[PDB]
């Protein structure tokens, strides 16, 4: 049994690591995009009006 | 029962979080399409 | 943001007011604000 | 003891197997991949060496017209001489619309005798495929070990059915997964946006 808790907390925690891992990983790259396509669309309107 | 307690609350705590994050990604994917 | 429309517009309007030989279309003078509002009203 | 089952439930909770999966359950909606895996007799190596050729090579097996493009997802090492290359092909249409060729009518093409022979000359020992109506085809009949009543409900719950189908998502690394794709995805968006941007600059210039 107390082999036991040595492992389970270990597999659980191993998992929290991945949770951290995702947490480390987070977006600005994404936020960037809408701004750009919103911007490119506008230049296209230029060229078109030109 | 010191320990088991620790398990659940950690569990629900992270779960409540994981939930919110998945959602993030959903909303990000969201924005992608 | 990166826009290029009103830079076209201004462009146009810039390109508008200067000349040329075109038998008719001579450049126009630009008003603005006080005289223009009234001009709009007329 | 009541005590042991709670332990079990908790252990159950934190797991990829899916017995009330740690209440990790979340479904993400994936729009509706064309992936074919190839085994080369070659070192991982013979592959990253000449990666250009190697898809060209693949390109011309396909016929080598422009409306056709070969893409490489990962290359992994299996043994001392040995490699797995996963690829998908996108096909362009008369109006300039792109999509990936489906895995099966790609696999059908490669299983050909000539093409197989040609692929073999390339070093390919083996190949495998992962997989209108076809949506209907996969979305029902359930997936990965996902419960049939939940899977149903993601189908009703689906906010945006053509752009999307329910795709099973599996705890944290899966979200990791999704993110990796998102990034994958991000770069290509950025780029295509650049291509539009370049063409617009050329027109304006």
SS3 labels along chain D: CHHHHHHHHHHHHCCCCCCCCCCCCCEEEECCCCCEEEEECCCHHHHHHCHHHHHHHHHHHCCCCCCEEEEEEEEEECCCCCEEEEEEEEEECCCCCEEECCHHHHHHHHCCHHHHHHHHHHCEEEEEECCCHHHHHHHCCCCCCCCHHHHHHHHHHCCCCCCCEEEECCHHHHHHHHHHHHHHHHHHHHHHHHHHHHHHHHHHC
A47 contacts in C (CB within 8 Å)?
4
**Experimental technique used to determine this entry:** cryo-EM
Q: Does A12 touch chain B (CB under 8 A)?
A: yes
The two structure tokens encoding residue D99 = 């999509």
User: What's the reported resolution, in angstroms, to a tenth?
Assistant: 21.4
Distance CA A12, CA D170 (A): 16
β-strand partners of D128? D37
Query: Among D127, D137, D110, D132, which Cα is nearest to D41's?
Result: D127
Of D13, D26, D175, the CB nearest to B11: D13
A23 contacts in D (CB within 8 Å)?
none
How far away is chain A from the Cα of C14, in angstroms, using its nearest Cα?
13
Of D22, D163, D182, the CB nearest to B15: D22
Distance CA D34, CA C29 (A): 63
Name residue, tokens 């190596």.
D45
> Subunits that touch chain B (at least 3 Cβ pairs < 8 angstroms)?
A, D
């Amino acid at each position: 049994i107390c082999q036991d808790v040595e492992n389970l907390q270990k597999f659980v925690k191993e998992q929290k690591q991945v949770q951290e891992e995702i947490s480390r990983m987070s977006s600005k790259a994404m936020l960037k995009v809408q701004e750009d396509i919103k911007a490119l669309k506008q230049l296209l309107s230029l060229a078109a009006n030109g | 029962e010191s320990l088991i307690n620790k398990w659940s609350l950690e569990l629900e705590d992270q779960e409540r979080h994981f939930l919110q994050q998945a959602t993030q990604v959903n909303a990000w994917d969201r924005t992608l399409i | 943001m990166d826009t290029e429309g009103f830079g076209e517009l201004l462009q146009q309007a810039e390109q508008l007011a200067a000349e040329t030989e075109g038998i008719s279309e001579l450049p126009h003078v630009e008003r603005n604000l006080q005289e223009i509002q009234q001009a709009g009203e007329r | 003891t009541l005590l042991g089952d709670e332990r079990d439930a908790i252990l159950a909770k934190w797991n990829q197997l899916q017995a009330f999966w740690g209440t990790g359950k979340g479904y993400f909606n994936n729009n509706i991949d064309g992936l074919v895996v190839l085994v080369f007799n070659k070192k991982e190596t013979e592959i990253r060496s000449q990666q250009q050729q190697l898809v060209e090579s693949l390109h011309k097996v396909l016929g080598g017209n422009q409306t056709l493009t070969v893409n490489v997802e990962g290359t992994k090492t299996l043994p001392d001489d040995q490699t797995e290359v996963v690829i998908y092909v996108v096909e362009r249409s008369p109006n300039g619309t792109s999509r990936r060729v489906p895995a099966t009518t790609l696999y059908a093409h490669f299983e050909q005798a000539n093409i197989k022979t040609q692929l073999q000359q390339l070093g390919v020992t083996l190949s495998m495929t992962r997989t209108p109506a076809q949506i209907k085809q996969l979305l029902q009949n359930p997936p990965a070990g996902v419960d049939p009543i939940i899977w149903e409900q993601a189908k009703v719950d689906n906010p945006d059915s053509e752009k999307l189908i329910p795709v099973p998502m599996v705890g944290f690394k899966e979200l990791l997964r999704r993110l990796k794709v998102q990034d994958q995805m991000t770069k290509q968006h950025q780029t295509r946006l650049d291509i539009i941007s370049e063409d617009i600059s050329e027109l304006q210039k």
